[PDB]
């Protein structure tokens, strides 16, 4: 009687070469249709909003200016409680922890995710 779910992330840091793409996966378990739910990511230090999906649409006017036109939320299997944060033209300033979360009405769990931005050369 409790849709109360645990949120799960990588479990190990995610790697990416500078100036590249990055994908951060996050899902809820048991998985369920997270289409109506609120999903989002925070950039660890000062909880800046990296990306926010709510009421079916991406809330663009609600993300930190530093991230505009740099993210995306893969929604292929959202009905499975699965999504992924994709980021373009990576930079070191993207190195560090992130925080993903799902809000099921008055319920809301989160998972910590971390990104390693390594230097090619």
């Amino acid at each position: 009687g409790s849709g109360q779910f645990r949120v799960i992330g990588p479990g190990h840091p995610i790697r990416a070469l500078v100036g590249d793409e990055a994908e951060l996966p996050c899902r809820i378990s048991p998985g369920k249709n997270a289409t109506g739910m609120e999903v989002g990511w925070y950039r660890s230090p000062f909880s800046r909003v990296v990306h926010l999906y709510r009421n079916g649409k991406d809330q663009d006017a609600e993300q930190a200016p530093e991230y505009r036109g740099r993210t995306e939320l893969l929604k292929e299997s959202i009905g499975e409680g699965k999504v992924a944060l994709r980021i373009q033209n990576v930079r070191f300033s993207d190195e560090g922890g992130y925080t993903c979360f799902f809000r099921d009405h008055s319920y809301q769990e989160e998972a910590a995710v971390e990104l390693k931005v390594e230097d090619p050369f």
Partner: antibody
């Protein structure tokens, strides 16, 4: 089994500060957003904001920004609200509500009264 | 901010009559992912807190008697009490339960004439 209870000084001097507290029992206190609602006779309900105990996340109503301030201590399953520079407008019955996976605010505390007056 | 207008501001009926309450929102209250209108109706009897009757524009909370029904969509909803009861005397508030800052209507007071 889920039930909230409110409490806090019922009489305070204008231009001071009151910290009404909300105690919750019957659940994993840290994963449900708590809502704070003001209500006064010549009016209906007012939504002040909410807070996610544990994460420590906050969302306030624009008009209450600066006026109100939330926090909580997992140690006691108590969420707090501190209204400041109290005014007669600040005279009312404040509630705190919580919810579940399908509804936000299905549970309401008994509410406590607060009157501002020197 | 979304504003909610309730009407009548109050009405009186006798036990057993059908009653219908209005609440008209200034904005849409539809979540696209749910394809559901996030509106709620609360009953408030004198002295205690508000009771939640229906959420999502038309879904009954556990326990609430079936004589209570909330329909609507778009910016216009309505609460209907099939056959009024004495204990149904109270104040009824409707609430934007989808967009911040949350907002409640002015309420519709229901008197019981006899």
């Amino acid at each position: 089994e889920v039930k909230l209870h409110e409490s806090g000084a019922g009489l305070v001097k204008p231009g001071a500060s009151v910290e009404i507290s909300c105690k919750a029992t019957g659940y994993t206190f840290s994963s449900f957003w708590i809502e704070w609602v003001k209500q006064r006779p010549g009016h209906g309900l007012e939504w002040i904001g909410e807070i996610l105990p544990g994460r420590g996340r906050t969302n306030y109503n624009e008009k209450f920004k600066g006026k109100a301030t939330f926090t909580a201590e997992t140690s006691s399953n108590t969420a707090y609200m501190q209204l400041s520079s109290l005014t007669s407008e600040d005279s009312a019955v404040y509630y705190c509500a919580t919810g579940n996976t399908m509804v936000n605010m299905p549970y309401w505390g008994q509410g406590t009264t607060v009157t501002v007056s020197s | 901010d979304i504003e909610l207008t309730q009407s009548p501001s109050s009405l009186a009926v006798s036990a057993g009559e059908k009653v219908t309450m209005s609440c008209k929102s200034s904005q849409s209250l539809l979540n696209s992912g749910n394809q559901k209108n996030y509106l709620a109706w609360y009953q408030q009897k004198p002295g205690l807190p508000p009771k939640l009757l229906i959420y999502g524009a038309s879904t009954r909370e556990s326990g609430v008697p079936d004589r209570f029904t909330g329909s609507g969509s778009g910016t216009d909803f309505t609460l209907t009490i099939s056959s009024v009861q004495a204990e149904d005397l109270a104040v009824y508030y409707c609430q934007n339960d989808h967009s911040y800052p949350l907002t409640f209507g002015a309420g519709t007071k229901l008197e019981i004439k006899r």
